[PDB]
């Protein structure tokens, strides 16, 4: 069985090709002791107070290879419990990943881990695959990074890719700002954890942000309560939707960027005119920070306001969307048609890391 490892900004999703879900999901982090000897994922939480905690793909591009190899070694030996030499491994990459980067990934797999074969796929591309389409425009918001990726006949159009350096860690931080400004105590990593859960449980995307601010101002009907373990109930009403409102208004955390509805629209307007009609009717959302209730509906209404009046627009938001990158990999990795596309160890010895292009 082939392996599928999605190298996410905050979490690794990995498992086997042919499966409907990943087997292992864990923070994309390496911890080394200071004293005196390596832990990854859940464990670099599970022994956190004696380590230096590294984040080798904070931002989505892999920044340190040592720590990255560590993440892979953990993923192969602890988490999937596999011999990497027995399995094809499909690896994911961020949109706009530097070629020296993709070659490096390839070098590590073959050289270090000794895989019989491998392949690098773009994350957003896989998510579009998971939604059974080969043309569409993907919004992928995950932990550390958001992109808009328009895709034609199976191939990202890298010149139209848009990037927003704001994603769900930035939203947790902001809920954390909000709540701490209200008098509450959230600093510790046991306490970010709480803020995250509050965000993941209660936050939603307003259909109309001012229409929603006024409902919160006039009745108590949007006020929800959350019990910290220390007994404290924290009541929130407008914060629920101010937090994810930042994807659309990046000014909320002091950023000068276009919001996601806008980057979606600019990205379409950088593609071929003759394929715009099909991006518009095939906007797919993916990644954990797309999970807010109302985001598809808001995205519909905003694009509508931007597009020409006659344009058929469709937003698609799979309930799997936290994991469609990975599912897309699992699908593609398992298809008969894909099997002549794997980069084989023979192919690597003969062509070098350059082959992966």
């Amino acid at each position: 069985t082939a392996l599928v490892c999605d190298n996410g900004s905050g979490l690794v999703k990995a498992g086997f090709a042919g499966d409907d879900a990943p087997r292992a999901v864990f923070p994309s982090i390496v911890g080394r002791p200071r004293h005196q000897d390596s832990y990854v994922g859940d464990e670099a939480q599970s022994k956190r107070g004696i380590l230096t905690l590294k984040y080798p793909i904070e931002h989505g591009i892999i920044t340190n290879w040592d720590d990255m190899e560590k993440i892979w070694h953990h993923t192969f030996y602890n988490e999937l419990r596999v011999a990497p030499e027995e399995h094809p491994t499909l690896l994911t990459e961020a949109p706009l990943n530097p070629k020296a980067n993709r070659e490096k990934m390839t070098q590590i797999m073959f050289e270090t881990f000794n895989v019989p074969a491998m392949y690098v796929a773009i994350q957003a591309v896989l998510s579009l695959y998971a939604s059974g389409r080969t043309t569409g425009i993907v919004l992928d918001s995950g932990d550390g990074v958001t992109h808009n990726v328009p895709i034609y006949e199976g191939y990202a159009l890298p010149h139209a890719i848009m990037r927003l350096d704001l994603a769900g860690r930035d939203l947790t931080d902001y809920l954390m700002k909000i709540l701490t400004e209200r008098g509450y105590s959230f600093v510790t990593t046991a306490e970010r954890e709480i803020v995250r859960d509050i965000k993941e449980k209660l936050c939603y995307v307003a259909l109309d942000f001012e229409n929603e601010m006024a409902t919160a101002a006039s009745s108590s009907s949007l006020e929800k309560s959350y019990e910290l373990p220390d007994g404290q109930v924290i009541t929130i009403g407008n914060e629920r939707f101010r937090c994810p409102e930042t994807l659309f208004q990046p000014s909320f955390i002091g950023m000068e960027s276009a919001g996601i509805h806008e980057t979606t629209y600019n990205s379409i307007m950088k593609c071929d005119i003759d394929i715009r009609k099909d991006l518009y009717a095939n906007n797919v959302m993916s990644g954990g920070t797309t999970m807010y209730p109302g985001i598809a509906d808001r995205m519909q209404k905003e694009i509508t306001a931007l597009a020409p009046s006659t344009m058929k627009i469709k937003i698609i938001a799979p309930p799997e969307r936290k994991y469609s990158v990975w599912i897309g990999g699992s699908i593609l990795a398992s298809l008969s048609t894909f099997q002549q596309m794997w980069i084989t160890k023979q192919e690597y010895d003969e062509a070098g890391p350059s082959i992966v292009h």
């Binding site: 499966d19 409907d20 006949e153």
Partner: peptide, 21 residues
């Protein structure tokens, strides 16, 4: 020159059901 259509067809047509649980 030949590297899409059969792959295209399995992807679009793939039954997400047929996936191990």
């Amino acid at each position: 020159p030949k590297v899409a259509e059969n792959l295209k067809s399995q992807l679009e047509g793939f039954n997400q059901d047929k996936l191990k649980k």
